[PDB]
Scaffold this active site. Sequence first.
Site, PDB file in Angstrom:
ATOM      1  N   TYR A 118      25.676  47.718  82.566  1.00 42.19           N
ATOM      2  CA  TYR A 118      25.019  46.589  81.767  1.00 42.19           C
ATOM      3  C   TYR A 118      24.936  45.487  83.206  1.00 42.19           C
ATOM      4  CZ  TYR A 118      26.194  42.405  79.115  1.00 42.19           C
ATOM      5  OH  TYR A 118      26.137  41.162  78.161  1.00 42.19           O
ATOM      6  N   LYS A 162      29.208  51.275  75.683  1.00 38.01           N
ATOM      7  CA  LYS A 162      30.923  50.655  76.079  1.00 38.01           C
ATOM      8  C   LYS A 162      31.206  51.499  77.213  1.00 38.01           C
TER       9      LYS A 162
END
EC number: 1.1.1.184
Lengths: 276, 275
Positions: B192, B94
């Site tokens: 990411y 997240k």
Amino acid sequence: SSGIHVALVTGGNKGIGLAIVRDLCRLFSGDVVLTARDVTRGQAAVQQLQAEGLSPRFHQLDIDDLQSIRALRDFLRKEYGGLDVLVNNAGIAFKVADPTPFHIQAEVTMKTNFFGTRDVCTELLPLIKPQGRVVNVSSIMSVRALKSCSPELQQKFRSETITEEELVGLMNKFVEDTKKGVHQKEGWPSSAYGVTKIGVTVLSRIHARKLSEQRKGDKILLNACCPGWVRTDMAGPKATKSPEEGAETPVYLALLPPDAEGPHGQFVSEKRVEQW
Amino acid sequence: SGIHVALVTGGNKGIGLAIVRDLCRLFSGDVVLTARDVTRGQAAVQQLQAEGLSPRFHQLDIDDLQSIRALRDFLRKEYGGLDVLVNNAGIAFKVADPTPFHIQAEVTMKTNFFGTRDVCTELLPLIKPQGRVVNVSSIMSVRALKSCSPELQQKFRSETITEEELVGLMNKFVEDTKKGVHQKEGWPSSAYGVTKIGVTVLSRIHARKLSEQRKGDKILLNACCPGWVRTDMAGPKATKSPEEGAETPVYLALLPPDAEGPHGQFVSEKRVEQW
Ligand SMILES: NC(=O)C1=CN([C@@H]2O[C@H](COP(=O)(O)OP(=O)(O)OC[C@H]3O[C@@H](n4cnc5c(N)ncnc54)[C@H](OP(=O)(O)O)[C@@H]3O)[C@@H](O)[C@H]2O)C=CC1
Ligand SMILES: NC(=O)C1=CN([C@@H]2O[C@H](COP(=O)(O)OP(=O)(O)OC[C@H]3O[C@@H](n4cnc5c(N)ncnc54)[C@H](OP(=O)(O)O)[C@@H]3O)[C@@H](O)[C@H]2O)C=CC1
Ligand SMILES: N[C@@H](CCC(=O)N[C@@H](CS)C(=O)NCC(=O)O)C(=O)O
Ligand SMILES: N[C@@H](CCC(=O)N[C@@H](CS)C(=O)NCC(=O)O)C(=O)O
């Protein structure tokens, strides 16, 4: 209390867990936390130890309740800034001739022994400090169960590259296969307890690998172990070891001298590595 | 003629499941749904079976070389190779996950780049003539690229970069985060994102190798972004449904036989984008 070393035992109100708390109170240079799922039995165990001249701290913990695990996590993070020793001792077993339907025994036993233990690791492993040690109490029944699995299943469980998510899938498959009444055909052994302890042993192998790759240099050691056959409420009185004797290998693994490189990711019985 | 087979990684939920559903409808042959969790994988197959579709199942965790190699061996035995490969499996922490950034970098890279890389290493040799390979990247790769130092951008945009050079750069990012020097070393802020630079550039490299080694076999390999999709990864504020998300990967997997392109491109909304 971040400058004080802290050791914690799960399922510490009786049996092997209580014997481990006793030993750590004597040998561990720091605080020792006895945890228990029933606050009343936990505090009674602490009071009992006080009458033996020992003073473990107490904190409630039920490894089947993620909010209980997270409350303990927050406590440790807040008071100690982490954890030095974690002993995952909590576990259950149905009797050999228990009439509870097998798929229920499978589900309930897996819920605590594998998933509960896994949840404690998920939440507390990040808190382990350098030179820390983690001890997962498994069982030599894990090896018996392993060798009773199909060759296909043995290959997966002995793999050096198995992931936590693969293992979770295999543990849930056992439980589903018992419910569908097809566990024999699918290559599983007849001991639900045994299979849950395969989960514990293999989870230990996975987590030791993860520590080596995420925390190189932090000198943390994590192992699974069998305490032997111990006279407790689980095994009954025919067993050959006292709880104090049963606690010997888990304590050995908890107190491995600083800078030791091993054992790590091993399955240990009588202080020696067993081949997995 | 004979049997054709298509395979999707991370097929039990999200964009992957939607791709499997589309392929079951549009691809003539076997469509293999793979998942790392056999229980979730079989539940996903049951769901599609309730809808009238008949996907095959095989376990696959792209973090596990032995799982990848078992799949390789299964495909060789059962099919003699593979016609369509969709590398969809991926993870993300997240935006506000408290996990230490260097651990986010190591864990995310291990799956998104190294896992994807291992599947390609093992399964690319099995791809048949007129085969298609689709690597699901993300527009976050372009945004990450544009956030790198000029010097790193030059390396990642290079038409001559090698797989081994790219591996070294991905490992360098992970090392720099652990050392606490990644910002100074020219790296962007999204772990990411950097892993998807890896996926996008690996795709460019592999298309180049296919053209060098297997010219005449008409294989097309591309990277893509499915767009911003409402899944467990992105959440409910995302602007696309999983079915919408599947549209570009499915378009790339089903490119008509003999098409000259796209090949080695980064494709979004079925359109080639500038890298
Ligand atoms: N021969 C033996 O005795 C052997 C035992 N083992 C392992 O040793 C470990 C300890 O077993 P042993 O001392 O013999 O068994 P006991 O039944 O005497 O003690 C088990 C302990 O675990 C606790 N526990 C069970 N479930 C939970 C849970 N949900 N959350 C928190 N605590 C829980 C119990 O708490 P409560 O009092 O509330 O029930 C108790 O404190 C177990 O993992 C067992 O599998 C392994 C090999 C041999
Ligand atoms: N959602 C979005 O807005 C966007 C997503 N993407 C990319 O699309 C792809 C799919 O993501 P999305 O569907 O959103 O995510 P989801 O989390 O919903 O699904 C991801 C899938 O990948 C699988 N997976 C993750 N790690 C592994 C692994 N080690 N081995 C095998 N399977 C694995 C998951 O399995 P499991 O269920 O067991 O976790 C799951 O099936 C990813 O590559 C993502 O990076 C790109 C751009 C935008
Ligand atoms: N029906 C149960 C039997 C479990 C079992 O083995 N029970 C106890 C006897 S109650 C035990 O003491 N095992 C401990 C060990 O040696 O690890 C199952 O299949 O799980
Ligand atoms: N803390 C992470 C954040 C990762 C991230 O961007 N989030 C995911 C989770 S919200 C996403 O949904 N978007 C994916 C995409 O658009 O490709 C990192 O630096 O890697």
